[PDB]
Design a protein around this ligand. Structure first.
Ligand SMILES: Cn1nnnc1NC(=O)c1ccc(C(F)(F)F)cc1S(C)(=O)=O
Ligand SMILES: Cn1nnnc1NC(=O)c1ccc(C(F)(F)F)cc1S(C)(=O)=O
Ligand SMILES: [Co+2]
Ligand SMILES: [Co+2]
Lengths: 381, 381
């Protein structure tokens, strides 16, 4: 069921912001690794004495990378006189985030009809405020509330190009890479206790539990009215033979934070071919492929959705497949994006549920846990 | 003249270590940008709970990238029980370095006959000690003294693979990139006062002033006995019409530090072709090309060293050329490697002074200051 209880008008995922120590190197590695173009900048060359911020785009997917300059550059400024293009930025908060968590996501940004109302209603409804609504050049309004750990849910709204004060990146610098990635499908947090995290977040958003379908985790998914903003949350299961990777996340991240970003591709086979070509030359590595038993059992499961050629192409690329009662899902996971075993990326493509495609079509790969266990067990013999 | 006054036996540049917030992303960007192979690692996968360190190699050039993990991972260790492969590493020192300087060089490492003696004689001769000599697995000895700002001169010596505790990187991960870079030619520091910096460093090394040949800087070059270890130092000139870029460095870096690394290529034309192909797809950008007047005046200067074809190839790639009384030098400079206008890279190739090639053959490009001024002046009209 879908009660459509959003307490304010939510549109779509707008951008994801990584807090970094050096934004240039992370941005350039991600661009090559994922096929995302440099499309806007806010830094010293644009008058910003506070932070360096570089935006990568692919389709509607926006990855923002931000790092602080030396505070001495802006020591004479005050908030009314700031040159920061993102007024919520804070040198100390940023350095503290990165030294506590390493490279990771600071802001999950969703676009809303009215960022001030969304902020006001949110905190009226239990949200811990993080940065009050601020109106940028009479054009854009931005506001932030705590989501979990040191991650904020950021609201953005436009009266009528990324943000004021950002400049388009010169086209000679902007090389039009594209490996097929098109938008953010879901952004997933890890926490020590699912219950209170769910209660808090659904409490101030009105997001409902997305209706779905013993190793690892327990999860639940929060979704907006049209279920295009999807915010799953995991917690660890303690005691198992294999140590919970959610617990490993919490230890290495120093607590709760964003675990994985799932990026929708319009052609997962082209995306995975292009990213795998670059794994060893600056891009991203992928988790170990499932054993061939897994693909031998795929025909009995999605033989009506994927031809024998498409299923063997899954085998080369290491793609996983799962299926709801309404759609089929193709998915694969990268290795951690940085030094720590914390944040990683998921590539997905959804087939089915056309009316546009409805959100979550196929679920999130729930069936692939038992299928992978049964496959390792079958293959071993 | 060359007094050969080294106070201890110095061999060659051994490696350069960057202190980072995330070593994975910097390392992967540098590898693609410069054509350096992943050759060794020390991290969680090798038992190191303290720091992540990744080594890139090209020829004899070794670039080490290191970042701290969460201190909680090693909270039960003490120095005798440490899992750090580089015993001089310190979480607080590293986080402080990166938050004060951003991405940059922490250690210039030279190999010496005996690292304990080199340390002892150095501090006996005025060197501020930074990390005392430590013997790694009865095989390698490492010691560190302050060089300038927060940069250390690191001594390494072997009784008889990078360091103990590092593992060779699996060849599937190791893609054999190579754009022709072969070794470190010189490593250059920026300081506010040349005099005391020279006095201190030459004081404890015995390095002599390398004998050489109004906009910017004043410099001098320190060299070892055979002049293969070259450590130039700059200071700003205040008052000029154009603000000294040494002063800009000092302000943005929060003080003294390593300004540029000069990497020797065995074929600067192949190197610059390969790096320029990648500038906009994750690699490095280059400083703006000199005006064509500069290349029109090149025939009158190195017409006997470079054919008309080689000089026009310089024009495409933006290469600078200079000439001593013994050799010719080809050089070009990258844009800053990271967010701040601080550290950058120089690519060079030296032609002449064969007996092997003697160090510094051609100088360091002194003549290119007046030649560039005269070129901008000539071209303008
Ligand atoms: C619940 N949820 N919400 N958003 N995403 C998710 N689940 C996943 O994406 C997911 C799906 C399948 C697997 C499996 F079985 F292949 F290992 C692992 C994950 S995993 C550990 O979490 O990455
Ligand atoms: C003295 N020294 N020691 N080691 N390296 C050096 N000099 C250089 O490499 C050098 C050489 C020529 C130019 C010029 F004229 F093209 F701008 C700029 C530099 S620069 C600012 O310093 O990068
Ligand atoms: Co997922
Ligand atoms: Co130089």
């Amino acid at each position: 069921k879908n009660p459509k209880s959003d307490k304010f008008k939510v549109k779509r995922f707008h951008h994801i912001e990584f807090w970094c120590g050096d934004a240039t190197n992370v941005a350039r590695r991600f661009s090559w690794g994922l096929g995302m173009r440099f499309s806007a900048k806010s830094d010293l060359s644009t008058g910003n004495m506070v932070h360096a911020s570089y935006l990568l785009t692919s389709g509607d997917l926006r990855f923002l990378f931000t790092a602080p300059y030396s505070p001495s550059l802006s020591a004479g400024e005050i908030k009314p006189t700031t040159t920061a293009s993102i007024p919520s930025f804070d040198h100390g908060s940023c350095r503290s985030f990165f030294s506590s968590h390493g490279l990771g996501v600071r802001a999950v940004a969703i676009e809303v009809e009215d960022a001030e109302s969304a902020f006001s209603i949110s905190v009226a409804n239990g949200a811990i405020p993080s940065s009050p609504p601020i109106v940028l050049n009479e054009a854009v309004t931005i506001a932030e509330v705590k989501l979990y750990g040191d991650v904020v849910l950021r609201y953005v709204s436009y009266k009528a190009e990324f943000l004021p004060g950002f400049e388009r990146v010169e086209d000679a610098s902007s090389f039009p890479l594209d490996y097929g990635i098109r938008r953010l499908d879901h952004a997933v947090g890890n926490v020590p206790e699912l219950g209170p995290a769910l209660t808090y977040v659904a409490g101030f958003t009105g997001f409902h539990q997305f209706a779905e379908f013993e190793s690892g985790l327990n999860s639940a998914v929060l979704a907006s009215n049209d279920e295009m903003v999807l915010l799953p949350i995991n917690e660890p299961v303690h005691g198992t033979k294999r140590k919970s990777q959610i617990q490993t996340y919490l230890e290495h991240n120093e607590g709760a934070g964003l675990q994985h970003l799932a990026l929708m591709s319009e052609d997962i086979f082209r995306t995975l071919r292009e990213m795998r070509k670059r794994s060893s030359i600056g891009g991203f590595d992928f988790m170990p492929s499932p054993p061939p038993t897994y693909y031998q059992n795929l025909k009995k499961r999605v033989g009506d959705v994927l031809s024998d050629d498409q299923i063997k192409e899954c085998e080369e690329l290491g793609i996983l497949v799962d299926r709801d009662d309404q759609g089929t899902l193709l998915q694969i996971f990268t290795k951690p994006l940085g030094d720590r075993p914390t944040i990683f990326i998921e590539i997905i493509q959804r087939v089915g549920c056309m009316m546009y495609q409805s959100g979550g079509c196929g679920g999130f790969g729930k069936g692939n846990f038992s299928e992978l266990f049964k496959s390792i067990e079958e293959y071993e013999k």
